[PDB]
Design a protein around this nucleic acid. Structure first.
Lengths: 69, 122, 125, 60, 141, 201
RNA sequence: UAGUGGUGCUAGCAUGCUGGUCACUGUUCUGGGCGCACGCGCGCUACACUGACGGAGCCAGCGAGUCUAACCUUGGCCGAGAGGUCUUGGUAAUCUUGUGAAACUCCGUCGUGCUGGGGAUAGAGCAUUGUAAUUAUUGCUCUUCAACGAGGAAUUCCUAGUAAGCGCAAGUCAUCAGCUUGCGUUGAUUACGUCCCUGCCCUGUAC
């Protein structure tokens, strides 16, 4: 099987409700537990972080670290 | 709307890949040639191939097979100064390995070393 | 003319020369402010001689340093050594051996390398 | 259960390659009852072993 | 006072290149989007629309910090490692045709000028301009 | 406290570091405790430092490396393979991100979690060849060395052909090893060594 | 023939800071040759995310150079590149040269798919050295995209600024190295012991 690479409306709804459940999130965290490619996850984090649903604690290109807050 | 597989020049291309890279499935379409064609077509390079509509796969197909009209610098092309007729061409699809697998046979007909050595090795 | 000293530091091939004079608390490396030292990870390695003694000590002196050759890492150790040696040299001449040794106590408590080069040298073959 | 013991004397290198050191070690829980054991890694006096078996002694 | 030396390198570049694109006086060669910028490179610059302005800003800063430069030295600076396929890597200089036009383009708008002892030196108007962008960059924080 | 203004203004958060040294200016070494008395002389955590890039030289005397702080030791063991030799700055960054992650998965001062993983991992019984094997005791120093080796290897082989970065995997090993969690590679390795030694004694 | 600071002139910023421009520390000629079913050995490049690619940051040491005429080359100009052209300094701590080197650092693209890993083999064209490049010296551009998933039995080097990573200079030399020697940059883990294996050196009876 292959991960999704375009955002279906149903997964968009799934993303917004579920992500605040997780203590820690990262590119790997999304790609692992949700069937999306890494090229979505980089965009989704910037979206949700500007939306204020998750709190950044550090950012470093190759790594980024966001938290429930 | 989105199409998972498409066919052009009798080659299949899957939609799930960046358009620039997806096109390189076609014999003769290298990465640089693919990249520059997309720019001249002014498609969004970041779109995935399955996003495009028919009138957008056309124009692209047209530019690939008429490159000199769009002032591509000619030195970009793989068949400069052809031996029979001094025109420049770019070779695509099944037409690749029809000029290849012929120029060697033309050398065989003239009994040149390189042709003999090839067919002798076979 | 004005109370001033020069001091130098070493590491491997990097050679940092530092000048100190009375003035207003400023620290520049090659004319840039020391907060822009690079790479970022090693920047705190240069704050050490500031935090370890306390910023008040610097308020009346101007520090500027030029680092010359070496490499990206080795030059970092050269400047921090040049700073520390420069600081005690000024106190030795313009206050007292009491404060001088107070400085030396703080530095050598944390890292001997702040005052003395490790003398390592490449194998002669 | 594990028992701690303090190195009181080091006896010498042992084993075919010199890869094992023999040691004299004193029980830390109660002094004396001294025992001799085989130690694999580098060791010094005042080091503490964790004798997971107690009622056994090294050959000599 | 403020100097260009007082600002983080990449932070200053991003600010000034964006401004310079808005001025529009900086003139592009037009063959842009074909050239690789180095014979050691593979694929052209990925920021296809903006990359020329960003390089132009870098050159100005580098000359500002120094006595004078010429085209040869810039080709060395922007060089890189070429893979040479199965053979070991080697240093290779970047394209000249790019960098020479950048110097000429910057001269047209008066930031930089040809110098005695060869090469180019910063203009007094270059100083005046670049300092102003620096002050904005600090204050914009 | 006071802001002690200077003509090159140091940032506020750097001035605040003046009163207590913290690793990465972020965590204190105070209240870090070693649970097993046998290791206390070897798990150096007592001297504070700002960043795990000490220049010190430890080769000249055979026990002197026991004075090097534990955090420095970990960074070295990451620099391991031939494609990674010399790249210490790469390793330092890895550690910095690793501690942050552990500060969120669980909530303890993460330096304490590292110490727990080390002390819980080091084998206490082993064997040598005589052929046959005979059981032997292992000295506290070597217990520490074995801990550091097993940890980095368990992370490295999980991050090969990965979707999770090095820091994502190394952080999980440390957490799994501070627990009694047999899921971790390092704990699995400890068990076999001791049960083998038991049979041969 | 080196560095710092002051002094004179001077630019920008602000009302001091960063830059440019006196003191101290036999003979001979033409053409060819120096091919590969396979065995043994020293190497180069990889199997990817501790990565590949794009942009930006920006740091050495040891060498070597012409009037015998033509070496090392700065600056201006032309061209996508390789490369070309007009001038210039150095018989050298004085000029090339701060030999602005690579790894490396930061910000983006890619997302575990022989994939954007890897670049063998092969087609077309443009240049450069030489008296002459066909069986092809080297460089540049486009196209073709092979094996290879960390490798059985065996086996090499090594204890600190050392191993390993990375690059440069000289050597040979019309041109042409994946070679040899030297130099610098980044920089670990594991012993500080033994006679088990291998090999060397001392002092009569089952052989």
């Amino acid at each position: 099987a292959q991960h999704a690479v375009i955002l279906d409306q149903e997964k968009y709804d799934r993303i917004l409700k579920e992500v605040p459940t997780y203590r820690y999130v990262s590119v790997s965290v999304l790609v692992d537990r949700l069937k999306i490619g890494g090229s979505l996850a980089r965009i989704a984090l910037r979206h949700l972080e500007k939306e204020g649903i998750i709190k950044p604690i550090s950012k470093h290109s190759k790594q980024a670290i966001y938290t429930r807050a | 709307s989105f199409q998972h597989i498409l066919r052009l020049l009798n080659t299949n291309v899957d939609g799930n890949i960046k358009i620039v890279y997806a096109l390189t499935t076609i014999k003769g379409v290298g990465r640089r040639y693919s990249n520059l064609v997309c720019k001249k077509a002014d498609v969004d390079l970041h779109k995935r191939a399955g996003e495009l509509t028919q009138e957008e796969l056309e124009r692209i197909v047209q530019i690939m097979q008429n490159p000199t009209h769009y002032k591509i610098p000619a030195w970009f092309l793989n068949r400069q100064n052809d031996i029979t007729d001094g025109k420049d061409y770019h070779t695509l699809a099944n037409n690749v390995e029809s000029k290849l697998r012929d120029d060697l046979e033309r050398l065989k007909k003239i009994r040149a070393h390189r042709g003999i050595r090839h067919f002798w090795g076979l | 003319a004005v109370p001033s000293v020069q001091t130098f530091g070493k590491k491997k091939s990097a050679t940092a020369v530092a000048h100190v004079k009375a003035g207003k608390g400023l620290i520049k490396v090659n004319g840039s402010p020391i907060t822009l030292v690079e790479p970022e990870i090693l920047r705190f390695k240069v704050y050490e001689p500031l935090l370890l003694v306390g910023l008040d000590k610097f308020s009346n002196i101007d520090i500027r340093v030029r680092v010359t050759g070496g490499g990206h890492v080795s030059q970092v150790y050269a400047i921090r050594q040049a700073i520390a040696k420069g600081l005690v040299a000024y106190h030795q001449k313009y206050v007292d051996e009491q404060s001088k040794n107070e400085l030396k106590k703080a530095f050598t408590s944390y890292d001997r390398t702040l005052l003395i080069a490790d003398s390592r040298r490449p194998e002669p073959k | 259960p594990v028992t701690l013991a303090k190195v009181i004397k080091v006896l010498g290198r042992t084993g075919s390659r010199g890869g094992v050191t023999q040691v004299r070690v004193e029980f830390l829980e109660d002094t004396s009852r001294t025992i001799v054991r085989n130690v694999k890694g580098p060791v010094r006096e005042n080091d503490i072993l964790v004798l997971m078996e107690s009622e056994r002694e090294a050959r000599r | 006072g403020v100097s260009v030396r007082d600002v983080a390198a990449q932070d200053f570049i991003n600010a000034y290149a964006s401004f310079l694109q808005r001025q529009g006086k900086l003139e592009v060669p037009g063959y842009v989007d074909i050239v690789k910028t180095s014979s050691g490179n593979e694929m052209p610059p990925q920021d296809a629309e903006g990359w020329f302005y960003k390089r132009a800003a870098s050159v100005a800063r580098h000359i500002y910090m120094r006595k004078q430069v010429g085209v040869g030295k810039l080709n060395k600076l922007y060089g890189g490692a070429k893979s040479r396929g199965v053979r070991p890597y080697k240093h290779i200089d970047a394209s000249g045709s790019i960098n020479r036009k950048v110097l000429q383009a910057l001269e047209k708008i008066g930031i930089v000028e040809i110098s005695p002892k060869g090469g180019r030196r910063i203009s007094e108007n270059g100083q005046r301009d670049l300092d102003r962008i620096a002050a904005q960059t600090l204050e914009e924080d | 406290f006071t802001p002690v203004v200077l003509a090159t203004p140091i940032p506020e958060e750097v001035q605040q570091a003046q009163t207590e040294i913290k690793l990465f200016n972020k965590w204190s070494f105070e209240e870090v405790e070693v649970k097993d008395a046998s290791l206390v002389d070897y798990v150096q955590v007592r001297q504070p430092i700002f960043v795990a890039h000490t220049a010190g030289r430890y080769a000249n005397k055979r026990f002197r490396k026991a004075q090097c702080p534990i955090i420095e030791r970990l960074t070295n063991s990451l620099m391991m393979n031939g494609r990674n030799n010399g790249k210490k700055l790469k390793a330092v960054r890895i550690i910095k991100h690793t501690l942050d992650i552990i500060n969120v998965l669980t909530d303890q001062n993460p330096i304490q979690v590292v110490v727990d993983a080390i002390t819980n991992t080091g084998p206490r019984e082993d064997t040598t060849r005589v052929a046959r094997r005979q059981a032997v005791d292992v000295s506290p120093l070597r217990r520490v060395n074995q801990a550091i080796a097993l940890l980095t290897i368990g992370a490295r082989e999980a991050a090969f052909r990965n979707i999770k970065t090095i820091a994502e995997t190394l952080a999980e090993e440390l957490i799994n090893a501070a627990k009694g969690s047999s899921t971790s590679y390092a704990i699995k390795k400890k068990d076999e060594l001791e049960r083998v030694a038991k049979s041969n004694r």
